Amino acid sequence: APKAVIKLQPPWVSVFQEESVTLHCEVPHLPGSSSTQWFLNGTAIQTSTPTYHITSASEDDSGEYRCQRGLSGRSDPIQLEVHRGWLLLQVSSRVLTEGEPLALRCHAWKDKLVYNVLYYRNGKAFKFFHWNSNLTILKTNMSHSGTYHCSGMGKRRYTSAGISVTVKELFPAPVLTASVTSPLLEGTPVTLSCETKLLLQRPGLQLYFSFYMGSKTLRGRDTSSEYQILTARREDSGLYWCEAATEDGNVLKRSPELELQV
Amino acid sequence: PELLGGPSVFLFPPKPKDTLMISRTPEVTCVVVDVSHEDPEVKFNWYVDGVEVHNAKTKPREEQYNSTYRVVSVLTVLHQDWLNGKEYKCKVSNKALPAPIEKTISKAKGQPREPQVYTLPPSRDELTKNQVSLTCLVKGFYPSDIAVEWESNGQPENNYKTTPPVLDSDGSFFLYSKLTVDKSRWQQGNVFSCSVMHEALHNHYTQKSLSLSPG
Amino acid sequence: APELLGGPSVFLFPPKPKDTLMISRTPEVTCVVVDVSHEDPEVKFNWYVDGVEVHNAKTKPREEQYNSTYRVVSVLTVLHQDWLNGKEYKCKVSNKALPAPIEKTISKAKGQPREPQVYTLPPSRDELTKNQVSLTCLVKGFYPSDIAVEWESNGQPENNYKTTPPVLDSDGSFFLYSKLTVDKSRWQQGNVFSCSVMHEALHNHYTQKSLSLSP
Ligand SMILES: *[C@@H]1O[C@H](CO[C@@H]2O[C@@H](C)[C@@H](O)[C@@H](O)[C@@H]2O)[C@@H](O[C@@H]2O[C@H](CO)[C@@H](O[C@@H]3O[C@H](CO[C@H]4O[C@H](CO)[C@@H](O)[C@H](O)[C@@H]4O[C@@H]4O[C@H](CO)[C@@H](O[C@@H]5O[C@H](CO)[C@H](O)[C@H](O)[C@H]5O)[C@H](O)[C@H]4NC(C)=O)[C@@H](O)[C@H](O[C@H]4O[C@H](CO)[C@@H](O)[C@H](O)[C@@H]4O[C@@H]4O[C@H](CO)[C@@H](O)[C@H](O)[C@H]4NC(C)=O)[C@@H]3O)[C@H](O)[C@H]2NC(C)=O)[C@H](O)[C@H]1NC(C)=O
Ligand SMILES: *[C@@H]1O[C@H](CO[C@@H]2O[C@@H](C)[C@@H](O)[C@@H](O)[C@@H]2O)[C@@H](O[C@@H]2O[C@H](CO)[C@@H](O[C@@H]3O[C@H](CO[C@H]4O[C@H](CO)[C@@H](O)[C@H](O)[C@@H]4O[C@@H]4O[C@H](CO)[C@@H](O[C@@H]5O[C@H](CO)[C@H](O)[C@H](O)[C@H]5O)[C@H](O)[C@H]4NC(C)=O)[C@@H](O)[C@H](O[C@H]4O[C@H](CO)[C@@H](O)[C@H](O)[C@@H]4O[C@@H]4O[C@H](CO)[C@@H](O)[C@H](O)[C@H]4NC(C)=O)[C@@H]3O)[C@H](O)[C@H]2NC(C)=O)[C@H](O)[C@H]1NC(C)=O
Numbered sequence: 067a068p069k070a071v072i073k074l075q076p077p078w079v080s081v082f083q084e085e086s087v088t089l090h091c092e093v094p095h096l097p098g099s100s101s102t103q104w105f106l107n108g109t110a111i112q113t114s115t116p117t118y119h120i121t122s123a124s125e126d127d128s129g130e131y132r133c134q135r136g137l138s139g140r141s142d143p144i145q146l147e148v149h150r151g152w153l154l155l156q157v158s159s160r161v162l163t164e165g166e167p168l169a170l171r172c173h174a175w176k177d178k179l180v181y182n183v184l185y186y187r188n189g190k191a192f193k194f195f196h197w198n199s200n201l202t203i204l205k206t207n208m209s210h211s212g213t214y215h216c217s218g219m220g221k222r223r224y225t226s227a228g229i230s231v232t233v234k235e236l237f238p239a240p241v242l243t244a245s246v247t248s249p250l251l252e253g254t255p256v257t258l259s260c261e262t263k264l265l266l267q268r269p270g271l272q273l274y275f276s277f278y279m280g281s282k283t284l285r286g287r288d289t290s291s292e293y294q295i296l297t298a299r300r301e302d303s304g305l306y307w308c309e310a311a312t313e314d315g316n317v318l319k320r321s322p323e324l325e326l327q328v
Numbered sequence: 329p330e331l332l333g334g335p336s337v338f339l340f341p342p343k344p345k346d347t348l349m350i351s352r353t354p355e356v357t358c359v360v361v362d363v364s365h366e367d368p369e370v371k372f373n374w375y376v377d378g379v380e381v382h383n384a385k386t387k388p389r390e391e392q393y394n395s396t397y398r399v400v401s402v403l404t405v406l407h408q409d410w411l412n413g414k415e416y417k418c419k420v421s422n423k424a425l426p427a428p429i430e431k432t433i434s435k436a437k438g439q440p441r442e443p444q445v446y447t448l449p450p451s452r453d454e455l456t457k458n459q460v461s462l463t464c465l466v467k468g469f470y471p472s473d474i475a476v477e478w479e480s481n482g483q484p485e486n487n488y489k490t491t492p493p494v495l496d497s498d499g500s501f502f503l504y505s506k507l508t509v510d511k512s513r514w515q516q517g518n519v520f521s522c523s524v525m526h527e528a529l530h531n532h533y534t535q536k537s538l539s540l541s542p543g
Numbered sequence: 544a545p546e547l548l549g550g551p552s553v554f555l556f557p558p559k560p561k562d563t564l565m566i567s568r569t570p571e572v573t574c575v576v577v578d579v580s581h582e583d584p585e586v587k588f589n590w591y592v593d594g595v596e597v598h599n600a601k602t603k604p605r606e607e608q609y610n611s612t613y614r615v616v617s618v619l620t621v622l623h624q625d626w627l628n629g630k631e632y633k634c635k636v637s638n639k640a641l642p643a644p645i646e647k648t649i650s651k652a653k654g655q656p657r658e659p660q661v662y663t664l665p666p667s668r669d670e671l672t673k674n675q676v677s678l679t680c681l682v683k684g685f686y687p688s689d690i691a692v693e694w695e696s697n698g699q700p701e702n703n704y705k706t707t708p709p710v711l712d713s714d715g716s717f718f719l720y721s722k723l724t725v726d727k728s729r730w731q732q733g734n735v736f737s738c739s740v741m742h743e744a745l746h747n748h749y750t751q752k753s754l755s756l757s758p
């Protein structure tokens with residue numbers, strides 16, 4: 067059976083003291099009237115409903131939460147942090163894969179008002195809002211990793227503490243190697259290759275490559291990784307480029323120019 | 329009452345030396361910061377003693393390191409207009425503002441007073457060191473807008489510092505300028521001049537010399 | 544209708560330079576808390592000297608401000624050598640309107656101390672035509688800028704003087720000028736005036752230079 071999954075409502079992994087948050091234990095195979103096992107830092111929690119509600123957050127609620135219901139495996143841990151301060155930069159996830167959206171919120175203590183808000187990444191402010199607004203980065207990449215914090219103007223200008231977010235890369239830039247050396251005799255077979263492979267352990271993931279030359283398309287998105295010209299006459303010659311992406315195409319990467327001469 | 333935020337405006341006066349030399353160009357500078365990418369258009373309106381003028385030059389938007397925009401409008405002023413106390417008003421309009429922001433600046437009011445300029449040789453206790461201090465005492469001037477320089481033989485001196493104007497007890501200001509020169513240059517009899525520029529001086533300047541001559 | 548985020552602010556001040564340089568005076572660090580609301584006026588202080596907590600502080604009574612806020616002040620007497628040795632002093636303020644206690648810290652300005660050079664300058668010959676007359680004390684080359692300069696004559700303090708703020712010189716040190724205004728009759732009668740300077744880099748933290756009509 068697949069693993070259970072914990073969801074946060076609101077999804078922010080950092081909350082203020084005395085704020086409320088509800089944890090949802092989701093299992094794919096929908097069960098009926100089955101107990102839910104909740105764990106805080108490995109210690110069993112005395113709550114068995116499918117959801118777990120923290121009514122007034124304190125430091126005792128901080129740590130890793132895991133859940134399990136029925137025949138499911140225990141969920142991957144979600145880390146909840148309880149803070150005190152003026153501003154709190156709330157994120158929807160601490161670790162992400164490229165292409166997965168990231169949500170940011172500059173949260174004011176007791177839901178007070180701040181304006182002229184700055185969102186920071188690694189010490190540099192990259193976004194400015196006259197009126198306080200959340201920020202979503204849909205197509206995340208490795209450059210969006212770093213320490214995030216925010217600042218806003220209330221009675222005085224207040225600044226939140228930092229929190230780190232990592233956007234793990236999926237596959238490097240698919241460089242296009244050359245098996246047969248150039249130049250080469252008209253008439254000799256060629257074997258093209260698109261060089262990239264996964265970095266994370268994604269069991270059900272497959273990249274689909276596309277071989278280009280100049281700007282005209284040759285072979286589109288295909289499960290194969292090699293463009294096979296039967297026997298080369300060099301009008302299929304020049305600047306060849308490859309592209310590797312997900313099936314959804316939410317992360318795309320290019321190749322260097324392989325000047326082929328046959 | 330929830331319309332706080334938007335850009336801010338800062339209005340700066342011309343440099344004192346530019347208002348005193350007719351060859352130079354005195355300018356008042358209207359700087360708008362915290363301009364958002366969503367509302368980047370800034371409109372400037374300039375007024376001189378209430379009547380509008382249209383000769384100001386607006387520099388294009390410039391993104392700052394905090395991802396905000398900064399827009400600057402420069403208005404050339406007439407030398408005598410500033411010295412006569414005319415008021416310069418910058419009105420800034422932007423969609424993120426509930427109403428235009430108005431900033432007004434002008435020369436400090438009050439009867440101008442002529443500065444007295446006195447040059448002071450180095451103390452004989454300082455002559456034991458390799459570098460000596462030449463002192464220019466400028467006192468009794470109003471307003472505090474002033475410029476002080478040093479020169480010798482038609483060339484500016486490369487090593488002097490001037491204190492900020494200090495309010496004296498009679499309502500006027502004073503300052504000191506310290507010129508540091510090598511002891512050999514002083515003992516060899518070179519003539520050093522302290523040049524003071526102020527609106528209350530004839531031709532907006534005076535200069536007093538200083539040289540080693542007890543014998 | 545939400546309220547603007549904000550609460551009390553804390554400002555934390557060093558001792559007077561003269562208090563830390565004279566063993567007969569008592570230097571004090573001062574913790575001032577502003578914007579204390581009427582609904583929650585209770586303020587608690589905790590002091591720490593180089594990490595270790597101390598309890599010799601004194602909290603003045605509150606004081607209403609024009610803007611309908613309170614301003615409580617806590618004063619902590621410090622040891623002369625403790626401040627001069629670079630020990631840090633920490634004020635910890637707690638109040639309901641704060642999400643967490645505020646912590647502020649000061650210590651002596653870090654940097655290699657540099658000894659001040661003190662020079663007295665007689666009046667310019669061109670100023671000898673006026674009724675009053677300027678006596679100049681040049682203090683240069685000192686670090687840090689924490690310094691005390693006074694005038695005196697015949698065992699009595701001369702208080703008709705002004706002193707410029709410290710000015711960062713081109714060699715990383717600070718300099719200033721002190722101008723004592725005297726009646727010309729006192730100067731030409733031969734009265735001796737003295738410029739007294741106190742600084743941590745001086746021997747015995749004290750030096751003085753005298754000035755009078757030489758012949
Ligand atoms: C996002 O960034 C922007 C950009 O900032 C830059 O980028 C960021 C990323 C940082 O790296 C930052 O460090 C960078 O600077 C931010 O914009 C800033 O916003 C703040 C306000 O939040 C502004 O602060 C005010 O500064 C005034 C003085 O500014 C001058 O000096 C500073 C350095 O000291 C410089 O950095 C400035 O650029 C200004 O420099 C002057 O510029 C003039 C215009 O060009 C020059 O004049 C012209 O010069 C030319 C020659 O080139 C000709 O000669 C022309 O003829 C001449 O006109 C001038 O020479 C030059 N001087 C110097 C020394 O360089 C302060 O005066 C002001 O204080 C007043 O207002 C405060 C209220 O905010 C208040 O608290 C103060 O008490 C004071 O109030 C005044 O009080 C007096 C009594 O003492 C009263 O009489 C007055 O009525 C009263 N006035 C008011 C209005 O109340 C501010 O401190 C800052 O200037 C600005 N930077 C820039 C570059 O514009 C932005 O804030 C960031 N956003 C966020 C959300 O963080
Ligand atoms: C509501 O009202 C209150 C009351 O205000 C007062 O009352 C009414 C009448 C009003 O009309 C108002 O005008 C009055 O002032 C408001 O409270 C004020 O709040 C503001 C902040 O919003 C405070 O401003 C800060 O001031 C600091 C220094 O202030 C001194 O100097 C001014 C005059 O220049 C005085 O007014 C102050 O009282 C301070 O004076 C000092 O007082 C001490 C008394 O404890 C003396 O120390 C002791 O003295 C005794 C003798 O009595 C013994 O000698 C002891 O041994 C000794 O310890 C001290 O000598 C005396 N000094 C002088 C010179 O008189 C500023 O430093 C500070 O600026 C910093 O912070 C800014 C932002 O916070 C920032 O922009 C600046 O850049 C600066 O940051 C510093 O920068 C330096 C570099 O220059 C760095 O090195 C620092 O690291 C860096 N630090 C920080 C933290 O960033 C502020 O400008 C104001 O002081 C305060 N007033 C009073 C009286 O407390 C309140 O704000 C109002 N509310 C609203 C909403 O408006």
Ligand code: NA
Pocket residue numbers: 171172173174198199200
């Ligand atoms: Na918010």
Ligand code: NA
Pocket residue numbers: 196364365366367424
């Ligand atoms: Na806007």
Ligand code: NA
Pocket residue numbers: 189190191192393394395
């Ligand atoms: Na920035």
